[PDB]
Design a protein around this ligand. Sequence first.
Ligand SMILES: Cn1ncc2cncc(NC(=O)Cc3cccc(Cl)c3)c21
Ligand SMILES: Cn1ncc2cncc(NC(=O)Cc3cccc(Cl)c3)c21
Ligand SMILES: [Cl-]
Lengths: 298, 302
Amino acid sequence: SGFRKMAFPSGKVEGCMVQVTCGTTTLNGLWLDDVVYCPRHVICPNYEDLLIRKSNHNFLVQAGNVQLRVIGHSMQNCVLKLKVDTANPKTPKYKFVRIQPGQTFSVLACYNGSPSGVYQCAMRPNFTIKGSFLNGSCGSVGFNIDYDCVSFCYMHHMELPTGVHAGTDLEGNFYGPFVDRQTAQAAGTDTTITVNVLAWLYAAVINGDRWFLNRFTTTLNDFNLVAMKYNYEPLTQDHVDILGPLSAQTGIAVLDMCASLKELLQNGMNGRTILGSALLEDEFTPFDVVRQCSGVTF
Amino acid sequence: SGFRKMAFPSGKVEGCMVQVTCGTTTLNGLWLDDVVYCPRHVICTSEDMLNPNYEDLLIRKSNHNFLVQAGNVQLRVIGHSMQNCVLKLKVDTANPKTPKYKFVRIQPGQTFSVLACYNGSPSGVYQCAMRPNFTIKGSFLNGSCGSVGFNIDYDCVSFCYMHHMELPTGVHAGTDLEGNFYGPFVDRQTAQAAGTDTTITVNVLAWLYAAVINGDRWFLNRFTTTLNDFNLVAMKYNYEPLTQDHVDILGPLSAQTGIAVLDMCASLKELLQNGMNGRTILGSALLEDEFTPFDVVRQCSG
Ligand SMILES: Cn1ncc2cncc(NC(=O)Cc3cccc(Cl)c3)c21
Ligand SMILES: Cn1ncc2cncc(NC(=O)Cc3cccc(Cl)c3)c21
Ligand SMILES: [Cl-]
C-alpha cells in the first residue's frame, strides 16, 4: 500500500554528469561514450558565428576531479556535442527519445556537474515542465528507464517568466514554441492531462478509496464536451484502450470512471481528499500506476 | 524557481542493494564493506510471526542457510549475528561500491529518501518524512522489506531507516540501521496500530517560508501571536506543538524573508481557520508538512 510520486533510480544517469565551462558560463553536460552533450547557449545570437570563433581548448570539461580534453565540437539544433578523448566507462545502455505531452520522466537536477536531487514530472500539454531549477541547472536531464536501458528524453535550457521550465530532446529540438535566447516568450494556456487523472483515480481505487465512485456511465462524446469546459485535454479512444488493464483490475469501466470525474469537476471534493490530495492529480500516466501498484524493478 | 518534493540521487545506495533468502522468505539487504544488513524476520515463517523467539530460530541456522545475491553473483556467508531487529550477515567479499556512510537515528519530522527494492533490485526512489506517530507514509508492496531510507550530505550517505512491515492502515514501520524500531512497534504479527497522527508544524511553517521566497504572499496577515496562543490554536487542528527550538531553527528563513517566526505563525492560524478559498500555495491545496527547514534552504539556495 501507499502511493507516492516516484522517480526512476538515478544511478545510471549520475555516472554521466559532467561540468562544462566556456568563458564565464558554467552548466552541466551528459557524457555518453566519447561525446559530451550540453545546451548550445554555453557559448553565449548567431550560434554558427559564435561556435566558429571557438577552439577545442576553450571548452573546459570536468568529470569529477578529472579534466576531459575536448578534441572536437559540432552543433545539432540547440545541443552542442563536444568530442572528448576519453570514452565514459560508466556509459549505460541508452537511447535518445522524444516524448509527447502527458508523458512523465525523472529529472536529475545538477549544479557544476554534481547531481543534487531527483524528482518526477510530466511534459505539460503547453510543452513546459513544472520543475524545480535554479541558475546553474542548465544541462540537467530527464529520463525513463525501461529494463536496463536509459531513454534520455529532456535537457534543461531555460526558465520562463512564470517559473515553469523549457528545454529540448537530446537531439536539440525544443519541446514547444520556444527559442534559446533572451526574448519575450511565455507559456501557452495549460490544460489538465485527462488520461493521467483517470489513471490516478484507478490508483486510488486500488488503494481502497472509493467514495467518488457512482452508478453512472457516460458516452465519450458527452465526457469530452464536459472536459473541454474545465480546461481538460480531450480523451481519445487510444486513451480508453490504454486504461483497459486498470479497468479490468478494479472492475470499473473507463467510461464509468469518466462519469466519476465529471461529478468531481462539477461538484468538487467537498472537504474530502483522494490519495492525500485535495486537487485532481495529472502527473502519473496509466503505465506509472501499473508499475507502482505491481512493483517493476531495474 | 519552482518547488518540488525532491529525493537525493539514489546511485550510491543502488550499488549496495542485495537479495537475501532464508528458506522460502526473500527480501532486500544492504551490503556495506563485508556485512549485509537485513530485517531479522527473514529467518521467520508466517506461523512464527505471532510469537517468534528469534534467538531460538537463529541458533538453528548455519551460514549456508542464508543465500545472498549481488546482481548475478552469489555472496558466500561466513558468519551471522543479531543486533536488535537487524540480522548482520558477514560475507566473504567486501562491496567495492561501498560509499562513505554513517548510520543515523532520526527524530519525527525529519525527512529522507526511500529506494524501494524487490529481490535486491531498485524500482523507484521517493521522498518522505518520519511522522510524529513514528510511522512513514510510504509506497511499499510485499517483498519490499529491507528497503532503506537515507540522506546524502556532501559525499556521505546517512542511512536512517530500514523497512520492516506494513501496519493495518497502510502505513509503514521500520528500524534505524542498528535494529531499533521507530515507535512502539515490534516485528510480530500482533495487534498493533499507529497512534493518532499529527501535522509537523515546523515543516508547514518552513513550506510557507518557501512560498514567500517563490513570490507567494497572499496568506500573510498584519497579526502576530504569542507562542502559547499559537500552540493552543494548533492543538485543536491536530498540529504538533511548536517549541522554542523550532522557532530558533526557523530563524534563517525569517531573516531571509523579513517575516518574524511568530508572524508566520499568525498566518498559519488564519489559514487553519479560513482554509485556502480556491487558492493554492506552491501548487498545493493542502498545507504541506514533509519539507523541513533544512530542505527549504537546500532547495531554494543550494
Ligand atoms: C537564471 N535561472 N534562474 C532560474 C533558472 C532555472 N533554469 C534555468 C535558468 N537559466 C536560464 O534561464 C538561462 C537562460 C536565459 C535565457 C535564454 C536561455 Cl536559453 C537560457 C534559471
Ligand atoms: C505484506 N505486505 N504488503 C504490503 C507491504 C509493505 N511492506 C511490507 C510488507 N510486509 C510485511 O508486513 C511482512 C511482515 C508481517 C508481519 C510482521 C512483520 Cl515485522 C513483517 C507488506
Ligand atoms: Cl533528526
